[PDB]
Design a protein around this ligand. Sequence first.
Ligand SMILES: *[C@@H]1O[C@H](CO)[C@@H](O[C@@H]2O[C@H](CO)[C@@H](O)[C@H](O)[C@H]2NC(C)=O)[C@H](O)[C@H]1NC(C)=O
Ligand SMILES: *[C@@H]1O[C@H](CO)[C@@H](O[C@@H]2O[C@H](CO)[C@@H](O)[C@H](O)[C@H]2NC(C)=O)[C@H](O)[C@H]1NC(C)=O
Ligand SMILES: *[C@@H]1O[C@H](CO)[C@@H](O[C@@H]2O[C@H](CO)[C@@H](O)[C@H](O)[C@H]2NC(C)=O)[C@H](O)[C@H]1NC(C)=O
Ligand SMILES: *[C@@H]1O[C@H](CO)[C@@H](O[C@@H]2O[C@H](CO)[C@@H](O)[C@H](O)[C@H]2NC(C)=O)[C@H](O)[C@H]1NC(C)=O
Ligand SMILES: *[C@@H]1O[C@H](CO)[C@@H](O[C@@H]2O[C@H](CO)[C@@H](O)[C@H](O)[C@H]2NC(C)=O)[C@H](O)[C@H]1NC(C)=O
Ligand SMILES: *[C@@H]1O[C@H](CO)[C@@H](O)[C@H](O)[C@H]1NC(C)=O
Lengths: 50, 106, 170
Amino acid sequence: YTMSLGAENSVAYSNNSIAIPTNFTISVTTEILPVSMTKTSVDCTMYICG
Amino acid sequence: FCGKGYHLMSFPQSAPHGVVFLHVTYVPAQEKNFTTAPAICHDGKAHFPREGVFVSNGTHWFVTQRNFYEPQIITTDNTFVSGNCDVVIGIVNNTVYDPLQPELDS
Amino acid sequence: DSTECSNLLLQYGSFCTQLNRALTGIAVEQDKNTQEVFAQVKQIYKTPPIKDFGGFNFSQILPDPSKPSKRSPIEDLLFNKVTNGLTVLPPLLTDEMIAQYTSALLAGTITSGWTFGAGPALQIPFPMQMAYRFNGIGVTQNVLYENQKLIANQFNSAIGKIQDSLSSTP
Ligand SMILES: *[C@@H]1O[C@H](CO)[C@@H](O[C@@H]2O[C@H](CO)[C@@H](O)[C@H](O)[C@H]2NC(C)=O)[C@H](O)[C@H]1NC(C)=O
Ligand SMILES: *[C@@H]1O[C@H](CO)[C@@H](O[C@@H]2O[C@H](CO)[C@@H](O)[C@H](O)[C@H]2NC(C)=O)[C@H](O)[C@H]1NC(C)=O
Ligand SMILES: *[C@@H]1O[C@H](CO)[C@@H](O[C@@H]2O[C@H](CO)[C@@H](O)[C@H](O)[C@H]2NC(C)=O)[C@H](O)[C@H]1NC(C)=O
Ligand SMILES: *[C@@H]1O[C@H](CO)[C@@H](O[C@@H]2O[C@H](CO)[C@@H](O)[C@H](O)[C@H]2NC(C)=O)[C@H](O)[C@H]1NC(C)=O
Ligand SMILES: *[C@@H]1O[C@H](CO)[C@@H](O[C@@H]2O[C@H](CO)[C@@H](O)[C@H](O)[C@H]2NC(C)=O)[C@H](O)[C@H]1NC(C)=O
Ligand SMILES: *[C@@H]1O[C@H](CO)[C@@H](O)[C@H](O)[C@H]1NC(C)=O
């Protein structure tokens, strides 16, 4: 299929109307960030020549 | 930068070769329409909100904080005066209460 | 197509697999970059049919209905001003979909300010939104409201100067 970007949401804009929140949600989200890699050492003489 | 929504706090957690941030954020919800105006015309003076916004539920005008609906009476303590009503486009007529008025009235 | 060359090439091992894997990683990384930059909203916002923004003109940045590509005049100018076993993979997001993402971002930031980036899109009049931005930089709302026509004229002039500068500089 041809992918859809998102659901269409036409915001009801007018020159004298505002939308004010009456409630709230305390949302906890996860963010995973890599920090380090495995510390690998290669003996060049032993790798090439044994 | 610290999660989707208005960032409140974050908590770090260790992970194998990594870190996991639990971002605690504030998300607005249950929004409601209101009729808004840039300024309030009272006694030939233009009043602007000190920290909030003017909202109307249909018949009465209030001032509320921008991120949560908490309507309060439009007074001189939460508004400031700058100029007359002839300059601001879209200024509406409403009364502005004075807390000092019953003090010298009594 | 030489069989003998491939037979001799097999003596060197998995170099070809490494090179193909690295190129595949770069190719998927480009699509990931485009997703990270442009696909930050899951709602496709649209502007109202009446462009009443209190004197502010956004015609040079909003999509042009007359153009089949649905690009802005600035975006159209930008696209006009940029000119043996090898294959070029097409990008996952085409130019019209990227333009649609930018249009959604523009509609959200015009009709809702910064509210759509933090949650549900809350409508606000554009002069009031500009006044909020003025308060963000430490200038009172009254200054914005009193000089609204001047600010709108300056903004329109600056946007036109941006289009002229892009069209006139190689
Ligand atoms: C604020 O008012 C607007 C306009 O009256 C509402 O927008 C309409 O909502 C209905 C109900 O879903 C839709 O069928 C219409 O298509 C909407 N019109 C537009 C132009 O978007 C809006 O829902 C109201 N918001 C609240 C929170 O009550
Ligand atoms: C704001 O939304 C919260 C949702 O977290 C509402 O809390 C719920 O209220 C209903 C009705 O009393 C209860 O049945 C739920 O158990 C409540 N949920 C939680 C998590 O406590 C709250 O009432 C809403 N407030 C307003 C003014 O709409
Ligand atoms: C807008 O809100 C105000 C204040 O909440 C409403 O005024 C109140 O209306 C009730 C219903 O009759 C009265 O009992 C209160 O005494 C009123 N308070 C004041 C200060 O007048 C007003 O009716 C609301 N308007 C709409 C259209 O909902
Ligand atoms: C808001 O109040 C002002 C001031 O009372 C009104 O301006 C008056 O309008 C009438 C009729 O247009 C004129 O005869 C007066 O001379 C005006 N007075 C001033 C000081 O300008 C204004 O019309 C009111 N607006 C609304 C919507 O009620
Ligand atoms: C917004 O700006 C656009 C372009 O800056 C205006 O479109 C111009 O309108 C005049 C008068 O009709 C024409 O002579 C120009 O050729 C138009 N320019 C382009 C690029 O089409 C537009 O009128 C302005 N105002 C509104 C409300 O959209
Ligand atoms: C909004 O636009 C209408 C015309 O559609 C106009 O009559 C009204 O005064 C405008 N209000 C503001 C606050 O600009």
